[PDB]
Symmetry: C2
Subunit: 271 residues, 2 copies
């Protein structure tokens, strides 16, 4: 199983992670969803970035193959603690961070609590602002296992539905039912879900204080996180650039892979 990488104790949690490349460190933080993991999210990104950077992609607690602590309290602050714990464990004093959706919210939160530990940030279809719950988001967080339910989620994520094959739906469904996966995931964002979007968000006031060079990326047709949210981030963060991909859904790293990889590498190259 390629989703299984290396193991390390971080913030007291046995963590599954991938570490490829050499040089300036870049932390990739995956999004949220049933069966999501660092590999599933970044398999097409790591190869490109690792040619110029040291790429670290961990499975956040509660997701992938990282340990799922008994009675663990899933929260924005605890997830930020995990990210910092991973960096500490690997002696990563400062790093660039790429956060996808849920992970984008965590990236912002990490940069706010540990500003000196974060250099440049790439926020993709990122959580981080309070936006009204969408049916797409409620469908993802409210997922229960079935190939049809997974097919719907994939449809929700994709701009080009022809990419949603029976095989992909089957494989992602299987990933979602691995031991303890659905259990931890379903316990994370129970109804009403607006509470969790708000909990993952950072205040306008705090976001405005971010000094980091930031690249905000969003798919025009994103059905999960509205484009308006990234437009808002683009107005709040001072040293920000906004790049919107037309004909692109919620996972820009998959549907606009080459463009995304090029933009990210060049953005970090400036540093």
């Amino acid at each position: 199983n390629l989703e299984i990488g290396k193991s390390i104790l971080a913030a007291g949690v046995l963590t599954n992670y991938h570490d490829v490349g050499e040089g300036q460190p870049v932390i990739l933080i995956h999004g949220s969803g049933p069966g999501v993991s660092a590999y599933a999210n970044w398999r097409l990104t790591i190869p490109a970035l690792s040619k110029f950077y040291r790429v670290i992609a961990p499975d956040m607690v509660g997701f992938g193959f990282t340990d799922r602590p008994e009675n663990y309290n899933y929260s924005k602050d605890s997830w930020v603690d995990h990210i910092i714990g991973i960096m500490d464990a690997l002696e990563i004093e400062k790093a660039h961070i790429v956060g996808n959706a849920f992970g984008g919210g965590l990236a912002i939160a990490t940069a706010l609590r540990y500003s000196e530990r974060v250099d440049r940030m790439v926020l993709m279809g990122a959580a981080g602002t309070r936006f009204d719950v969408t049916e797409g988001l409620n469908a993802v967080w409210g997922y229960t296992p079935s190939i049809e339910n997974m097919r719907n989620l994939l449809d929700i994520f994709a701009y080009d539905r022809s990419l949603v094959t029976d095989e992909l739906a089957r494989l992602r469904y299987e990933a979602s039912i691995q031991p303890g996966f659905q259990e931890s995931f379903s316990s994370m964002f129970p109804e009403p879900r607006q509470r969790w979007i708000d909990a993952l968000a950072s205040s306008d006031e705090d976001i405005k204080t971010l000094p980091n060079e930031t690249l905000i990326i969003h798919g025009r047709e994103d059905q999960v996180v509205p484009l308006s949210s990234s437009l808002r981030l683009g107005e709040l963060i001072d040293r920000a650039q906004l790049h919107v991909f037309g004909r692109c859904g919620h996972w820009t790293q998959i549907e606009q892979t080459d463009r995304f990889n090029r933009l990210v590498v060049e953005f970090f190259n400036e540093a």
Copy 2:
């Protein structure tokens, strides 16, 4: 005077233009403003692009050193005729087009009337949609010569006012008072100026028909053409990407030169 380049008859008008590089043709269309010319607008762009493309940058009729025909009727359609005439004169059957503001409006209009002659488009702080007249735009089109009036226009264009030096204001003022320059410019967009923004614009319906891969660029702080206009273009054009530069005014090719050049070259490289 480096603003003076080569001369060629195009659409019956003796035209001043620059032609550098080899390979795929790229037409650069400058913006509008007192003393504006192709060289003044693209001096920092041509060098970078000409390394991979054949770059053609003409002075649009009524601007720069191109002939100013007596009783000439300055209009969107006549300017489009000039662009096509330039391409015809140089045996350029199809080309990518980069349009800055006023030039962006012309690029859209050219792609609509001569779709087969246009490949990819880059629209910067582009005219093309009907946006409410801004004080910045009225100040530019309503300019009368003076170093102080030019200093104000430069301030209006720049995000970083420290770039507006006495020397630059002096040099641009001198360019604005060359024989016939202010005369033709002031005759172009007389009050009420909303009429001309509307005349340069293309309908939502027409814009939606554009099949071209398009890159829309805008400076967040643009005081001349509102960011909202490019956001609108980003929703209307199907194969579009929107890139907004924070800490950037109306002339992105000057204040975000390296980033702009990199984005444009890579965008054309995809073709």
